[PDB]
Symmetry: D2
Subunit: 254 residues, 4 copies
């Protein structure tokens, strides 16, 4: 079934996670043909500034995600930044996420694959679509069986990313493809382009969408510009399901 990965960018507090998890739980009940995965980062390990918000740590984060899965029965996903984090994170995360800048770090990918969990690799802004074939191979070699590749934009000049939708059908040759609707419009972002491009993604054909959502984006401690207002999530999901229903008839074979 179609995958919808959503949640607040960073674990600002398990308090915030529970509220978002409550809404995502409601949607999962409303859209039974959609597999929802709750997402949130326990650490923003690659912020540009040393003075920016990173988070409350791996322990506090895993703890919070635990509360979400136990209280709502929702699958979990979060990203790791160094090999040692794979095992402890795998205790809760159903899908281990590999950051875009780290999509070529062999040991990180192998550590994720060794946990037995599913692995979702964010395609680096420097990577060509066809070069993700080797990324998948590393994971398979490492024992991974459920593998995802996430489109999140490509470097286009300075401080700008472009989404080359040709990447969707290309990557589909070796893995399930997820479209990251929030970071793809981010400027190394205009919220005005989030919905339009999500529509494009489902019209082209993908296996799921990734969206950062927050009750009050403006008050968010991270991505206050691109995080989707929680209340708008239902409408966007219904919209992409309707577009997918009609467009899927034309999705090219493999």
């Amino acid at each position: 079934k179609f995958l919808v990965i959503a949640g607040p960018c960073a674990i600002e507090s398990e308090e915030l996670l529970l509220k978002v998890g409550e809404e995502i739980k409601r949607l999962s009940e409303k859209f039974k043909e959609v597999e929802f995965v709750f997402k949130s980062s326990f650490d923003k390990a690659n912020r540009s500034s040393i003075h920016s918000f990173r988070g409350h740590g791996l322990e506090y984060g895993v703890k919070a995600l635990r509360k979400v899965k136990e209280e709502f029965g929702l699958k979990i996903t979060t990203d790791i930044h160094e090999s040692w984090q794979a095992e402890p994170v795998a205790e809760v995360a159903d899908i281990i996420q590999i950051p875009a800048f780290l999509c070529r770090q062999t040991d990180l990918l192998l550590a994720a694959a060794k946990t037995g969990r599913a692995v979702n690799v964010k395609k680096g802004q420097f990577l060509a679509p066809w070069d993700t074939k080797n990324v998948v191979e590393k994971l398979k070699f490492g024992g991974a069986k459920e593998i995802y590749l996430t489109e999140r934009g490509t470097t286009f000049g300075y401080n700008n990313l472009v989404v080359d939708f040709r990447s969707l059908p290309i990557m589909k040759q070796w893995a399930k493809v997820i479209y990251d609707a929030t970071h793809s419009v981010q400027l190394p972002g205009m919220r005005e382009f989030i919905f339009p491009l999500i529509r494009a993604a489902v019209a082209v054909g993908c296996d799921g969408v990734f969206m950062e959502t927050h009750p009050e984006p403006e008050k968010a401690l991270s991505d206050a510009s691109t995080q989707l207002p929680l209340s708008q999530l239902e409408g966007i999901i219904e919209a992409i399901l309707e577009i997918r229903e009609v467009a899927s008839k034309y999705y090219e074979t493999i």
Copy 2:
């Protein structure tokens, strides 16, 4: 508003080729009554890479051929101009005058097209940012153009490659009707396998029309033989984009 489908063979290989494609476009126009069809073909490929490549049979022959299509099928006509003097003679048959992508900044060419009283469609240069088309529209309005179109046809992405930044559709819609060129946006300065998926994206995002080069036998074309859509596939593609447009339409943002 009626969706625009601009289609036809890339080059006017012969008046016969035109009538063959015109016949099919006329048939589709009868079926897809919610679509406004415009027959397109270039009387001259004035910017081919090689001096040895096919250019055409001249303006006189081309305009005469286009006039036959219009007379025989009652179809609207569009073709591109390359120098200012061509605007007047072309305006006699063309309902929409097309401005080539490399020439989207040539003031006199734009002015020449605008004073004819015909609609003008400017292909966005591969070097132009979406927001910089605002001045292109300003020039046309200044020159008398009342019906203006901007066509997305890809942007330079490294060497010999174009990428389609779909954010350009809503940006350009702020000042003109927007057309998506489904065949030139995938050509390597020609991966036909991406034509259909990208056109689906264009209509899902939202545009006012699509531009497609089509030929009875692409493999035998004298230009863009790798990107022209086989004529027999046109009907299916149009049906598909009309279906996607309809279901996505309620979500199109207001400019």
Copy 3:
């Protein structure tokens, strides 16, 4: 010998041309091993805004350039925008310049080549280095014998140009190569990068440099940001001649 093409961007008046021509004449006398070519456009035919300065026309322009060549004995170069302009311009211009956006317009190139004059094609911001081979072929087919290709930057994301210096040795395979030092840093520009990149061009190896210079750039009616202050021209020329003298020992064969 090394080529130095310089002059004010636009023919603001033959008055301005004479002053610049006077300085360029002085430099040509000082640097005998350098072939100076006086440059100025009679029309800015591709301005972004319809309300921008274009010039005084082809007639007034050719007239002014005439005064420069007659009063200083300097070679002349200016750009054409439509085929009919080649003949009248060829009456004065020793080298006919083809604008970057028009480097693929077959008839414009043929019209220039038919005049018997030398032709300098500005490499389009959309063109790959190796694709200039066909540009040269068109000109040769048209009767041109003295052909130049000018590097002026390549599209890099939006509103930015990057200079890929690998283009110099690549283009040298089929034509003499000129480096445009003023437009290459322009943003579809920071004057701070003009000199540094000119140094790079001569260290890599080229057949000449193109520089827009004006007595009072700030008061210029065009490119008031990138036009080099007339008084700084001598210093830059001496600098590139010294760098060339030493670096030329290492220029790769053809």
Copy 4:
């Protein structure tokens, strides 16, 4: 100031290979007394595209090999780290700790390197704008680094291609010493014919040093066999850049 030349085989194929290159670098250091040489080699290629490609013989073996080079030739040493825990063991032999291009934004790795008290050289990510290296330097200073270098190694330009925007040299010089990577800046994500011309450009523009991978027999290298410079060509290249630097130096702008 003394020009920095960082050179050595891309990967520590064997301690023997290291000593062979070390011998030549030591010889050149005796000739080019105005240059500060730093011997470089990676104990691990932690980001190869294929799982089947050569990675190395482990940190322990690599550090031991590098230590032999330092002991035998008295050469400064630099190698790259991939995870925070490697900073400490590496700092025991490395005078300069290198941060890989893809990892230039990984805060903990940068902090781990900075607290060792060693110099730190960060390869500018192919995704990073020149002005965004200012925060990279800030992180290192925050972490205790007193000697910081930024290395230009190209920027993503379309797919499988890198371009060197030389404007980055003067921009980055505003906050750190700048090094130009002559071998990785031309590799297609490997046109050896552009290595020399681009290094000439770097020194003419002005930088504080150059980085060059060199191997006795590049064709037999286990990594970057297409971009590593034959060791016999190193002397000539260094002489050439010293000559160009000298003549261009009086024109270097003040930051």
